Amino acid sequence: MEQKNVRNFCIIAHVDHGKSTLADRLLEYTGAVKMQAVRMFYKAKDGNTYKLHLIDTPGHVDFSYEVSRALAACEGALLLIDASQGIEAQTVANFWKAVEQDLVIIPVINKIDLPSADVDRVKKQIEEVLGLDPEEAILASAKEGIGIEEILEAIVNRIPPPKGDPQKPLKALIFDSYYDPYRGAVAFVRIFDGEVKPGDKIMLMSTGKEYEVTEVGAQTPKMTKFDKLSAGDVGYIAASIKDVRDIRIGDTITHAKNPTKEPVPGFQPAKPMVYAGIYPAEDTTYEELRDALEKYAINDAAIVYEPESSPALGMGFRVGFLGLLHMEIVQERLEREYGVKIITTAPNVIYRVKKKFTDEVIEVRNPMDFPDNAGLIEYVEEPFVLVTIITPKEYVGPIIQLCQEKRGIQKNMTYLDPNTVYLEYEMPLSEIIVDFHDKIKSISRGFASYDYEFIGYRPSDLIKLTVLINKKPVDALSFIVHADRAQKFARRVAEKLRETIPRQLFEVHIQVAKGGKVIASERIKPLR
Ligand SMILES: Nc1nc2c(ncn2[C@@H]2O[C@H](COP(=O)(O)OP(=O)(O)O)[C@@H](O)[C@H]2O)c(=O)[nH]1
Ligand SMILES: [Mg+2]
C-alpha cells in the first residue's frame, strides 16, 4: 500500500506498567525469536485499513542507546503510565528521549481497573510534569481489553505516516538484531529511503562491508518473509552475515552500488561501563565457562571478555557489561542456558589512570591492573552520572541522606505534585553499582524509582584496597574506593567475607589493606 497509510510506533513505559500486556491486546485485537518489527493491519473507523508496525523497545537504562535507536525508527510512541503508580523515573527519561526524536507521544493511563488507580492525579502529572494535554490521554486497561480500539485510532489519527522516497538510494536504520542459526545475523530495520529485496547487495555504512540479501520480511507475529521492504516499512533483513557485531545497532544499511548520501545520524558502537570477573564455581570448569560464554556472545553484540586468573580463584574471565541489569541477564542465562556454575566478583567501573612515567592515560577495567604503587599515580578519574529520582515526599529525607553518603551532589529538587518529589544528583557510577538499588528500594518501600545518564569522567581521590586471607592477597578481591570511604568499605568487605567463607581446621584471618597498611581485620575461628 501507500506510506500515507503506514504507522510506525513503539510503547515506552516504566517497568511493570503494562507494556507487554498492551502489545498483546493490540496484536490480538488486530490479528482477529523475540517479538520485534511486528506488522499489523487495522481497518480504522474512517474505512481505510492501515499497516501498523510495533517496534519493541528495551526498558532498562543499561540499554539506553538501543532505546534511542528504536525511537529513531518510529513516528510516534505510546507513553504507558500506571494509574496506580503515576509517573516514575523511566517514564520521564523515556518521554524526553522520545521528545528528542521528535515523536508524536500518545499518553495512555493503564490499570484504571485497579482500586488504587487515580487517573485524575496522573492527568495532573502529565500536564504539569510532561506538559501534555491531559485530554490527549487515553484511559485503558490492557488486562481487560478496555481502550484498545481507542489506542489504534489515536495511532492512525495522531501519529504521522512515514516520510521517505522508495525511489531514492536505500537508507535503512538498524534498531535491533539477533542471531538466527539458520538465517545468520539478522537485522531488524526501519526503511527510510528506497527498497530492498533478496539478491540485492547491501553495504553497512559504518564499516563499508558488503553482503547479498538472502531474505526480507517481518514478524506477523511469526517471522514472515516478504519479497521486499519499501520506504516507510519495518521488518528484518538476512544476508549471510557472520555475527551481530557486523550489524551494529544504530548503523545504516544502504546499497553497495548506489549508496545513500549520508547514514542515519546517531551511530555509536556498544560501550561497556561495568566490568567483573566471572569464575567457574562448584564442579563447572574453565572450558565449560569459556565455551558457554562463546555461545552466549553470539546473541549479544555488547558483551566483551578476556581470560583472567587470580591466585585463589584460578582462571576465569574479566567481562564487561552495559550495566548491572545486563550483567544479571548474562549471569542468569549462563547458568540457565548452559547450566554453568559461576562466582562473580564485585563489579567495577572503568577508571582512567595517569601514572608518572607513562604519557598516555591508562584505562583500568580490572582493579588488579590498578597500580600497586600509589606514589606513581599522577591522578585518576572515574565516570559520573546524572541520577534522576522520583519518590513520595515522605522518603525524600532518607534518600537525600543515602545519596550524599554515596558522594552525590544534589543539582535540583522539585515536586511532581503535593506528595511527589523529583530529584537530580551527580554521582560517581562506582557508588551507584554497589548496593544503591536495594538501599533506595528498601527505604522507599519499593515506591521510589530512579534513572541515570553518563555525564563524563572527573578526577577523584581514589585508592586501591587489597584483601588478604591469612597474609595472602587475593587480587580478585582488590578494589578501588574513594579515600574518604575506604575505612567503611574495608570494614564492610571484611565482615562480609568472613561470612562468605566457611570454617576449616585453621583460623581464617581476613585483612583489608591500604598500601601495605591493614585498615580492617576479621577472623573466623577454626573448624569448631
Ligand atoms: N490490573 C491490571 N493489571 C495490569 C494491567 N496491565 C498490566 N497489568 C499487569 O501488570 C503486571 C506486569 O505487566 P507488564 O505488561 O509485564 O508490564 P511491563 O513490565 O510494562 O511489561 C502483570 O501482572 C500484568 O498482567 C492493567 O491494565 N490492569
Ligand atoms: Mg514487559
Curated annotation (Swiss-Prot):
The keyword GTP-binding applies. Its EC number is 3.6.5.n1. One of its GO terms (cellular component) is plasma membrane. One of its GO terms (biological process) is positive regulation of translation. GTP binds at residues 16-21, 110-113. GO terms for molecular function: GTP binding; GTPase activity; ribosome binding; translation elongation factor activity. It is a peripheral membrane protein. It catalyses: GTP + H2O = GDP + phosphate + H(+). Pfam families: EFG_C (PF00679), GTP_EFTU (PF00009), GTP_EFTU_D2 (PF03144), LepA_C (PF06421). Required for accurate and efficient protein synthesis under certain stress conditions. May act as a fidelity factor of the translation reaction, by catalyzing a one-codon backward translocation of tRNAs on improperly translocated ribosomes. Back-translocation proceeds from a post-translocation (POST) complex to a pre-translocation (PRE) complex, thus giving elongation factor G a second chance to translocate the tRNAs correctly. Binds to ribosomes in a GTP-dependent manner. This is Elongation factor 4.
